[PDB]
Ligand SMILES: OC[C@H]1O[C@H](F)[C@H](O)[C@@H](O)[C@@H]1O
């Protein structure tokens with residue numbers, strides 16, 4: 001049977017199922033409704049930065065169609081919707097003046113979701129730093145971001161928190177550090193060789209530290225000022241792709257573990273244990289900032305749940321640990337990526353080159369967090385795969401590969417849960433085909449097809465798969 005034994009009965013009672021989007025990727029109205037530009041608006045509008053010179057000006061136009069999209073998610077039997085608030089839609093300059101039309105939009109969305117029995121899970125930040133804050137303060141390089149983010153978060157708690165009870169601060173600060181400041185391929189396009197300037201060996205760590213400090217400050221504000229009345233929760237969303245030792249050799253096993261530590265431990269060790277991973281301290285040394293005891297105590301325990309974005313897996317090959325001139329966060333790991341073992345690829349690829357379809361990676365990741373971090377409450381906040389550009393509507397709708405993807409990954413998640421992992425929910429990236437950053441509209445992650453000429457929505461087979469699986 002195409003559900004493969006999966007249904008709500010196959011998951012814990014009250015387990016949450018949802019879909020996910022992000023503001024810039026679906027809203028549109030990027031320069032309308034009072035919204036100020038984000039760093040992604042400037043980036044996307046620069047010729048050559050995005051596939052086809054595309055941008056999120058219109059995107060899926062969810063801004064005008066949100067009731068259609070909410071009706072669709074309810075008809076597909078989902079319990080929840082993870083979306084983000086655009087910082088520059090509320091504060092066009094990131095600070096000071098409030099854009100009331102922006103506030104009204106999120107009020108309207110949140111109220112309609114609740115009207116339809118859909119639980120809002122709200123991200124405050126998804127790659128979309130107000131451009132004004134980048135220019136005035138230097139964005140995530142400036143420790144002042146803690147105050148600036150806290151003030152923004154405070155406004156959101158005050159304005160929406162009587163209705164919103166499930167918050168996330170950030171989405172994937174590792175990717176911001178990696179792509180924005182190590183490789184320099186996402187805004188602000190910083191790296192050692194980059195035209196904008198930078199230092200791939202230092203800036204990724206500065207940025208990560210400031211994300212953690214800003215997270216902790218925003219949560220401290222929530223807990224001291226809003227929690228008593230509002231009785232909600234605040235977490236953070238982290239990407240974690242699985243790393244598997246190429247062989248059982250001491251050095252390959254060490255390499256896979258180093259990769260885990262530099263990937264997820266970088267944030268989870270501070271959040272759970274109040275310090276950076278030991279290996280990062282040992283290898284990165286004085287390029288890794290130190291939490292004072294007070295900061296570490298503010299950071300530790302500051303996530304009510306951990307959002308995990310899980311997509312793929314890689315084999316890791318080791319080497320003798322070397323004394324090396326620092327060059328980048330990426331080279332700091334001292335590992336070698338490998339995508340085949342015993343003559344077989346780890347998995348076939350989806351449309352995105354980085355996305356190897358490896359369902360057991362999901363078990364790997366969830367089991368690892370359970371065993372290593374005292375089984376914290378985890379929410380899978382994104383999981384999915386993409387189709388390529390240029391297909392016919394019908395070809396998009398017959399997404400049999402995506403159906404197989406969800407059945408397999410969810411079976412592996414069920415396996416980890418049945419072994420005792422504290423996973424509270426699962427969210428499919430994405431409800432809709434949308435703006436896939438550098439790939440623009442050439443990558444289609446949705447369970448619902450979006451015709452980007454007419455903006456019409458059409459559920460794909462995977463959407464119907466979810467509807468069947470999730471019926472009450
Ligand atoms: O790459 C697919 C998807 O991966 C993660 F979920 C990111 O948070 C999204 O912004 C992105 O679109």
Ligand SMILES: [Zn+2]
Nearest residue numbers: 061063064065
């Ligand atoms: Zn419109």
